[PDB]
Design a protein around this ligand. Structure first.
Ligand SMILES: Nc1nc2c(ncn2[C@@H]2O[C@H](COP(=O)(O)OP(=O)(O)OP(=O)(O)O)[C@@H](O)[C@H]2O)c(=O)[nH]1
Ligand SMILES: Nc1nc2c(ncn2[C@@H]2O[C@H](COP(=O)(O)OP(=O)(O)O)[C@@H](O)[C@H]2O)c(=O)[nH]1
Ligand SMILES: [Mg+2]
Lengths: 430, 188, 439, 61, 102
């Protein structure tokens, strides 16, 4: 009951899941073979949320892996915990999107996306009571940008009343990995806002800043950064799998964080995060956890949190801890920064408590705050986009696949609309 | 753009209009009769002129854009797609005097010819947003009577009547879309 | 022949509802499984368990409650724990999808699919009873499903049964410490439901109960567990007059006839004392005179409102223990003397006094210690206008710009619905000041 | 033989700072959730009346 | 479970060990007419002795006839390639007698 399916795409998105399941599998005690070897009786109270059942007793994540090139698709299985997936769910083409959005949204993806929706429909119809879907796609890559975005548009068209979630990584300016990054970003938001119920941004820049300062590990690796995004994945649905004082389903977080329909962009963080050595010393208590929760450096997005003002915030504490110390602390952080909290929404902090602590820590906190500061991220992406477009550079590729130059102008206007009106509520007062 | 598209176009010598005013205040006598002109190539150019704030381009753009839709007949519907992106910039100038100029022009557009508003509903997400900027900002004087009603300078008053016109001719679907942009609106 | 049927709706209701039965279960001699111990019959007399229970001929007993909720995790926990055997397996109705704090969801959209079943279970318990006096409903207004399903039941019950009295122990949000972010909205809408369908409802806002724990219990890390227990005694304090002996008895239908001056004003804020731990409860005499003052001490009000700011209409305050009537007479007279607690000009005598003998019992592993004398106060004060006002103002700020309106109008509730609720609180606010003026 | 063993297949596919948190913080019983510590403790008709107040300064935590 | 014809299967798989960087790799070659999506089994990496540990294999640990632990799946390395024997004899650790795979 109220279970969720998962479908992931793109090498960035596919790699994200290849670590998320490993992390999620550990919590319930599901070993790679799929045979039960758990420890706590509570480990299996609510396995239906993420796991189906199969004859013979081996479990299979409700994952539909999609990518337009077979090179990576044949890689995720071979990794650790890589064979929990039903290979029947796999779907892929034979050519490769080539970071060409039009290729991944009009020509190729349209050809293969008929099959992909088929497996999704079968998985969705199999659940007892459907709740929503969650995506893990990267906006810097074509197939994820185009094929990833197109799937949401259709999927919302079959299940208009169910919730949705998307994990996206936008390209920060200090580090660049795709020369065509600016183009696919502007078109992507043009379609994610109109249909996605919830979407949150995580930037490569933030990972590198967070990794090099607190953890201070000298040699980060793609395995490392994927871990932080792993904990955040599980930071939003903990109450769906274990008993808690204040359960807050995925829908519940939706109602309390979106004041108006067109603003559904969130930025996340995690804690505690202690250096490798200094863990034996820190004092893990509500006062200590709270301060590291709202710090600028911990946040996962390049936007400086103080450059804007918090429209709303969410907090889901983990494990056993007195509510009073939780309740009192939230109010305290709502006056020591009285200016940064918009003044026409009184009592603008939400708190949830769960009683099953994540393995590896005696306590934990997951942060989800809708900070108006995100205007910085979209503004700069507009700056890079405009420069490359007035000279009509790199556009002949897209125009060759049935697309017209008019469509790009429409998309650009829409993005400026969201940025322009997003700050509207920043200056309005009572 | 570095220069308003209107100014460059006029100086060349291809606009068919001139001032030649001899009367009460001012008037415009078109070098050629209106019906012959093509609306596709000219109609959006004039709308680019609304943005102009240095004379004489301000008025000389204004008077026509009111005039074009008055005697259009039925050809206006062809140009509806072409009028979206220009006008979007017009409302973004944030200048108080302009919004008074363009808002009346847009309001009169819907009533110019029949079966046009139904076409304009899908483009609400472009023209509606800035309209929310100043909905609540209005004069609060009190009992003392207002001397300024003669010329429409009240931003709040001008806009409020604007939506009313949009929904009456918008059609059945008009109401739902209008709310999704500006929430405070109340059905009529 | 006197019985009452308890109703629990909303996660807060069940959790507090869970606590309310261990207190009632223990005080009557029923083990967790419900089988009366072969020996050690702690209960003198008879018919006591009949007040809230029903005999099955031999052995165990059945609580008279129906737990209603839409999200099963909280309900599912009770069916697994140590109290599995107690509740009837076909009355713990559970849904499938959480209301997600959307009031329209639990009143118009989803609630209609479970209200029918709950009422059906209600009829079965009503028929078994003989002299049904009234109902008790617990619910936390700081949530959607709690308000929604809670509002429907009171609306549904008032027409199905009629003049039968009803009671409700709501739990409103704190003035500044708040859990949800839409709590102001559901407060104004919810108060509409029970402003025209209920006889009496008490205020037990969370923030105050936090304070009562700190100043007396000597605990700096209270949790939601201890909060429920304190509310448990007040349930015990009021209801204990029906199932035990008394030198001056008070009935449930005796409270609704002496605490509510008019059809509108039926909100009262209560308090309890003494609340003293074990390490300190035995170094003071606990004379009856000193306990009553603590009842009217302004720091121990269980509702976040200072009575000194308003007028007093009537207090229906009970006693328990070895209290003799002679002691009370001086106390009430002595209290009247004080100069900082003034009464309205139109109620020269406004005290309703009750006495009961069986002392409160100390549940093991809790916080409260053992005592002889305690007094539970359920008093209506003119100052309650503050809580309604403050919650009313919070409504205005968010509603001035139609923020969060789009998550309700899409759930079947007409847009004009919200406005009408404001008039009632606005109408109610002027009401308190109306009666307040001295004649 | 200190840093010369470096290999691309070893550096990239070996997580550095995101392995299991060191011991002394894992001391928690996943099966024990609240509402289970006291409500489900068992309950008893007769309680153990014994109480004690050790003559040592209670530890502050 | 469901097999009418069969009740227990066998996958023929070989293990490679690199001496350059202590890396292990497992790939199961294609078995004709087997109707199974066969490819890379374990991507080339370093695998620990027990899941989520900080102890790593040293080539002196592998040998024929003994059980290796690899993601809780139990492997039975059975046969030795021609080039394997010499290195063991060169380094000086005993080698065990082979047997055919059932
Ligand atoms: N007194 C008391 N109140 C509680 C406790 N737990 C939650 N609450 C109240 O419950 C309110 C929030 O509502 P929920 O706990 O979500 O219950 P609900 O209103 O039915 O909403 P749902 O969770 O969807 O069922 C808070 O404002 C609290 O006042 C508790 O342990 N004790
Ligand atoms: N955090 C993280 N990001 C990655 C990793 N690998 C790739 N990416 C991101 O993925 C983007 C490129 O994705 P791409 O290959 O074009 O996606 P595709 O088009 O779906 O194949 C880059 O901008 C990276 O930021 C990784 O291991 N960790
Ligand atoms: Mg709930």
């Amino acid at each position: 009951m109220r279970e969720i399916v998962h479908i992931q795409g793109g090498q960035c998105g596919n790699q994200i899941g290849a670590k998320f399941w490993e992390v999620i599998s550990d919590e319930h005690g599901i070993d790679p073979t799929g045979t039960y070897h758990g420890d706590s009786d509570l480990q299996l109270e609510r396995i239906n949320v993420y796991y189906n059942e199969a004859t013979g007793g081996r479990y299979v994540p409700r994952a539909i892996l999609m990518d337009l090139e077979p090179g990576t698709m044949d890689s995720v299985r071979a990794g650790p915990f890589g064979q929990l997936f039903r290979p029947d769910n796999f779907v892929f083409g034979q050519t490769g999107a080539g970071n060409n959005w039009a290729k991944g949204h009009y020509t190729e993806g349209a050809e293969l996306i008929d099959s992909v929706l088929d497996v999704v429909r079968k998985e969705a119809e199999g659940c007892d009571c459907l709740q929503g879907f969650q995506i893990t796609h990267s906006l810097g890559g074509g197939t994820g940008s185009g094929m990833g975005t197109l799937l949401i548009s259709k999927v919302r068209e079959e299940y208009p009343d169910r919730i949705m979630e998307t994990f996206s990584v936008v390209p920060s300016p200090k580090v660049s990995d795709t020369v065509v990054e600016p183009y696919n970003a502007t078109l992507s938001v043009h379609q994610l806002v109109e249909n996605a119920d919830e979407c949150m941004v995580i930037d490569n820049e933030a990972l590198y800043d967070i990794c090099f300062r607190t953890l201070k590990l000298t040699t980060p690796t793609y395995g490392d950064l994927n871990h932080l995004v792993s904990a955040a994945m599980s930071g939003v649905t903990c109450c769906l799998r274990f008993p808690g004082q204040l359960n807050s389903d995925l829908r519940k977080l939706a109602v309390n964080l979106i004041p108006f329909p067109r603003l559904h962009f969130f930025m996340i963080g995690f804690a505690p995060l202690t250096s490798r050595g200094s863990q034996q010393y820190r004092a893990l208590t509500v006062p200590e956890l709270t301060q590291q929760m709202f710090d600028a450096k911990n946040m996962m997005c390049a936007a400086d949190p103080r450059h804007g003002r918090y429209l709303t915030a969410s907090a889901l504490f983990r494990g056993r801890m007195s509510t009073k110390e939780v309740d009192e602390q939230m109010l305290n952080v709502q006056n020591k920064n009285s200016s940064y909290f918009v003044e026409w929404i009184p009592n603008n902090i939400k708190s949830s408590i769960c009683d099953i602590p994540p393995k590896g820590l005696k306590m934990a906190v997951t942060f989800v705050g809708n900070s108006t500061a995100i205007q910085e991220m979209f503004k700069r992406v507009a700056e890079q986009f405009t420069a490359m477009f007035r000279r009509k550079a790199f556009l002949h590729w897209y125009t060759g696949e049935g697309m017209d130059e008019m469509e790009f102008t429409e998309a650009e206007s829409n993005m400026n609309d969201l940025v322009s009106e997003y700050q509207q509520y920043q200056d309005a007062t009572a | 753009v570095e220069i308003n598209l209107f100014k460059k176009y006029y100086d060349r010598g291809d606009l068919p209009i001139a001032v030649n005013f001899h009367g009460a205040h001012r008037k415009i006598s078109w070098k050629l009769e209106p019906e012959l002109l093509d609306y596709h190539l000219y109609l959006p150019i004039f709308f680019e002129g609304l943005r102009e704030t240095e004379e004489p381009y301000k008025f000389l753009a204004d008077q026509g854009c009111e005039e074009l839709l008055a005697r259009g007949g039925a050809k206006i519907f062809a140009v509806l797609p072409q009028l979206i992106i220009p006008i979007k910039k017009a409302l973004s100038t944030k200048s108080h005097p302009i919004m008074c100029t363009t808002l009346k022009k847009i309001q009169k557009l819907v009533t110019s010819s029949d079966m046009i508003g139904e076409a304009l509903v899908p483009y609400y997400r472009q023209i509606l947003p800035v309209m929310n900027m100043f909905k609540n900002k209005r004069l609060n004087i009190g009992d003392h009577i207002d001397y300024s009603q003669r010329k429409n300078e009240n931003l709040s008053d001008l806009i409020q009547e604007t939506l009313e016109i949009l929904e009456k001719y918008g059609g059945e679907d008009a109401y739902i879309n209008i709310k999704y942009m500006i929430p405070t609106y109340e059905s009529c | 022949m006197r019985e009452v049927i308890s109703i629990h709706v909303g996660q807060g209701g069940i959790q507090v509802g869970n606590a309310c039965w261990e207190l009632f279960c223990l005080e009557h001699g029923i083990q967790p499984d419900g089988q009366m111990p072969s020996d050690k019959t702690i209960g003198g007399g008879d018919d006591a368990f009949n007040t809230f229970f029903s005999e099955t001929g031999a052995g165990k007993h059945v609580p008279r409650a129906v737990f209603l909720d839409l999200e099963p995790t909280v309900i599912d926990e009770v069916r697994t724990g140590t109290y599995r055997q107690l509740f009837h397996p076909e009355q713990l109705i559970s849904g499938k999808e959480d209301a997600a704090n959307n009031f329209a969801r639990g009143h118009y959209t989803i609630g209609k699919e479970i209200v029918d079943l709950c009422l059906d279970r209600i009829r079965k318990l009503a028929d078994n009873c003989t002299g049904l006096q009234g109902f008790l409903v617990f619910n936390s207004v700081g949530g959607g499903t709690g308000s929604g399903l809670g509002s429907l039941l009171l609306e549904r019950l008032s027409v199905d049964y009629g003049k039968k009295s009803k009671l409700g122990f709501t739990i409103y949000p704190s003035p500044q410490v708040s859990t949800a972010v839409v709590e102001p909205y559901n407060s104004i809408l919810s108060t509409h439901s029970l402003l025209e369908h209920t006889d009496v409802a008490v205020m037990l806002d969370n923030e105050a109960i936090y304070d009562i724990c700190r100043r007396n219990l000597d605990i700096e890390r209270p949790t939601y567990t201890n909060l429920n227990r304190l509310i448990a005694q007040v349930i015990s304090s009021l209801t204990a007059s029906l199932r035990f002996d008394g030198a001056l008895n008070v009935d449930i239908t005796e409270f609704q006839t002496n605490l509510v001056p008019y059809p509108r004003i039926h909100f009262m804020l209560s308090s309890y004392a003494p609340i003293i731990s074990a390490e300190k409860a035995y170094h003071e005499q606990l004379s009856v005179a000193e306990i009553t003052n603590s009842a009217f001490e302004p720091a121990n009000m269980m509702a976040k409102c200072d009575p000194r700011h308003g007028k007093y209409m009537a207090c229906s305050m009970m006693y328990r223990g070895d209290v003799v009537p002679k002691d009370v007479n001086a106390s009430i007279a002595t209290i009247k003397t004080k100069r900082t607690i003034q009464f309205v000009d139109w109620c020269p005598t406004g005290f309703k006094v009750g006495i009961n003998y069986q002392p409160p019992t100390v549940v093991p592993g809790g916080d409260l210690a053992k005592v002889m004398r305690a007094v539970c106060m359920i008093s209506n004060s003119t100052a309650i206008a503050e809580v309604f006002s403050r919650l009313d103002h919070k409504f205005d700020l968010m509603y001035a710009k139609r923020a969060f309106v789009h998550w309700y109008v899409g759930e079947g509730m007409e847009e004009g619905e919200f406005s009408e609720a404001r008039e009632d609180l606005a109408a109610l606010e002027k009401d308190y000041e109306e009666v307040g003026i001295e004649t | 033989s200190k840093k010369t063993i470096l290999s691309g297949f070893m550096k990239n596919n070996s997580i550095v700072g995101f392995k299991e948190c060191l011991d002394s913080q894992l001391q928690l019983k996943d099966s024990k959730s609240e509402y289970n510590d006291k409500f489900q403790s068992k309950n008893r008709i007769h309680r153990d009346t014994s109480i004690f107040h050790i003559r040592n300064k209670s530890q502050i935590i | 479970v469901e097999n009418p014809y069969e009740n227990y299967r066998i996958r023929k798989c070989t293990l490679y060990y690199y001496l350059s960087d202590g890396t292990i790799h497992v790939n199961e070659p294609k078995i004709m007419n087997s109707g199974i999506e066969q490819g890379v089994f374990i991507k080339r990496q370093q695998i620990p002795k027990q899941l989520n540990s900080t102890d790593y294999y040293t080539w002196e640990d592998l040998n024929v006839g003994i059980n290796i632990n690899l993601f809780e799946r139990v492997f039975r390395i059975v046969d030795c390639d021609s080039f394997t024997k010499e290195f063991f004899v060169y380094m000086g650790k005993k080698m065990n007698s082979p047997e055919r795979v059932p």
